[PDB]
């Protein structure tokens, strides 16, 4: 008798709900599971969704469970996660197109005239398939498989089919590996399965057969699909030294965009540090051989994804957080010194008598002398670059033209002002630190102006705008470009304490 909902609607919802618009600093996992198509990335907002999609036995549920149940000093949670697939072996072409719970065994009464159409190297049609029995979906899959086997075209000669129960979709897999493309098209015949079945209907994922690829190429392709994440890693078996070195080099090719986290054994640190000396953006973590992995390498990613940059005082430290679930690795002073000289991260125990407490200590990160070493600075630069880029693109998209005159310079400064104010609010910019003589010389060398060090000392930053002209490579023509330079005092976190006491 008419619903009060159509007049009044309250959504309610549990507390600690914070809508966010901007780049998400969320974890991304590269896996070798067969369920995930190669060219598509997926996201989840809860561990229950991950369980529904994958299942308890799969270790990805373990990773998601560990990832999600984290609380920072200010009460926050990652609230998101990303997944993508890496292919390490040549694969046959395949198709998949279902996500909604269409399968309630409606194949009954559809036995007459099944006219599904497959499009590939040669157009071919499928004979009528009996489905009125509809005993079980696996039986249906076997029936369609046999009907496909009745064909002689070699990629469909040894074709297979599969049904998953957690997620509802049908998969077709060809025979030949590494080459070939398949497609499916609906027909004018109303008595068809392709319309009712997932594929050939609206959003359907299609896969092209292709050889195995190096991991760096896989992550590059994943970024090309979408780059809204941070601090990716590789799941499953440990990678080889050469592959890790290549991935680190590729990450260093991007100029301070993501964080590469790996897990390695204690005895293996000597090899990696020599290989991956420099090449900033890579984090090394110590893994315990005796016990279970406990997924130590996720810690920096969880810490990074937990923080938010809209609220004041966002800058955090990585030196003292406690993870009760994880397992202790090192307990000796000399061992800690050796690992520190090798520039690694770990969890060190102290006391263990009466009480017991350990924390993920080293917030340091491997890299060259020029680039930032500590991690909080790295994260702050990531956020800052994202914000500046977004502001500049907004300026270009709103104003009709930006003249190459002083007024254009004024417009650019006016647009950049709010981002700088927010940065000062967060804590990425800091004020009051003293400047050494060599630092003063460095600053005066970078920017031609003297006395800028006074403003970077007091206010915390210094910016300039300059426009010039240039010629591009693709076309012989010339355009006008704008050059800006930004210098600021990096944020810092308390790490060590000095004290003194005298009685008079």
């Amino acid at each position: 008798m008419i619903s009060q909902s159509r007049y009044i609607r309250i959504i309610s919802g549990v507390g600690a709900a914070a809508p966010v618009a901007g780049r998400k600093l969320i974890l991304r996992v590269m896996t070798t599971n067969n369920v995930i198509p190669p060219g598509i990335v997926i996201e989840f907002d809860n561990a229950n969704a991950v369980l529904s999609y994958f299942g308890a036995q799969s270790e990805e549920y373990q990773r998601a469970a560990a990832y999600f149940k984290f609380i920072s000093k200010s009460v926050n949670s990652p609230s998101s996660i990303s997944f993508a697939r890496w292919v390490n072996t040549a694969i046959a072409p395949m198709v998949v197109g279902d996500n909604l719970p269409k399968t309630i065994a409606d194949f009954a009464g559809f036995s007459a005239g099944v006219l599904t159409i497959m499009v590939g190297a040669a157009e071919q049609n499928i004979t009528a398939i009996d489905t009125s029995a509809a005993t079980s979906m696996d039986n249906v899959a076997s029936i369609i498989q046999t009907e496909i086997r009745k064909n002689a075209d070699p990629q469909l000669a040894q074709a297979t089919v599969t049904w998953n129960q957690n997620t509802n979709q049908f998969t077709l897999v060809g025979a030949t590996i590494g080459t070939g493309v398949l497609a499916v098209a609906k027909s004018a015949d109303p008595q068809d399965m392709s319309t009712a079945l997932g594929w050939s209907t609206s959003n359907v994922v299609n896969v092209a057969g292709q050889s195995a690829d190096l991991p760096d190429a896989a992550v590059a392709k994943s970024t090309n699909v979408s780059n809204n994440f941070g601090s990716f890693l590789f799941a499953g078996a440990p990678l080889d030294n050469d592959q890790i070195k290549a991935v680190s080099a590729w990450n260093a090719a991007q100029n301070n965009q993501f964080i590469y986290t790996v897990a390695t054994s204690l005895a293996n640190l000597g090899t990696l540090f020599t290989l991956v000396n420099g090449n900033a953006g890579t984090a090394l973590n110590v893994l315990s051989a005796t016990a279970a992995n406990d997924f130590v390498e996720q810690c920096p990613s969880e810490i990074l994804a937990a923080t938010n940059y809209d609220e004041p005082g966002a800058s955090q430290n990585y030196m003292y957080y406690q993870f009760p679930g994880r397992n202790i690795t090192v307990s000796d002073d000399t061992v800690a010194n050796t690992v520190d000289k090798s520039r690694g991260n770990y969890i060190g125990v102290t006391q263990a008598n009466g009480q017991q407490l350990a924390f993920y200590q080293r917030g340091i990160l491997c890299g060259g002398p020029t680039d930032a070493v500590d991690m909080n600075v790295y994260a702050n630069e990531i956020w800052l670059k994202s914000a500046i880029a977004q502001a500049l693109l907004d300026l270009f998209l709103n104003v009709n033209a930006v003249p190459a005159s002083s007024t254009g310079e004024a417009m650019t400064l006016a647009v950049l002002q709010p981002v700088l104010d927010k940065a000062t609010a967060n804590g990425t910019f800091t004020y009051g630190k003293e400047i050494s003589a060599v630092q003063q010389q460095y600053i005066t060398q970078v920017t031609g102006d003297r006395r800028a060090w006074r403003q970077v000392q007091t206010l915390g930053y210094w910016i300039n705008i300059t426009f010039s002209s240039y010629t591009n490579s693709n076309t012989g023509l010339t355009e006008w470009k704008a050059n800006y330079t930004l210098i600021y005092s990096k944020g810092d976190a308390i790490r060590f304490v000095e004290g003194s006491d005298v009685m008079i």
């Binding site: 009060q4 909902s5 009044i8 309250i10 309610s12 919802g13 549990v14 507390g15």
Partner: protein, 108 residues
Amino acid sequence: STSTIRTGTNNDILLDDNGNMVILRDVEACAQDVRAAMLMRTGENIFDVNSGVGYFEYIFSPQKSYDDARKSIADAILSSPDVTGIEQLDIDITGEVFGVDAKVITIH
């Protein structure tokens, strides 16, 4: 501290797969309670008149101020067993929709 019986998006008892009623603990019970209280509207409660939200006398009807509706909604959100204080109230009123947004504070 309080507790209640879980209900679905429509205000009916929702049963799990096993077939057992669930007694929700705090926090979530606060959410369900505050939603139900905000949906109550005045004059329906026998044995207690003048409790609820005066929709037809303060919102739907033409008004002079709109402050009185804010007072009524603020009172309705209160009187819950665990609600302590109200942090925000918005009352957007854009176009045809009468926007309302609120965040509450609980001991637990």
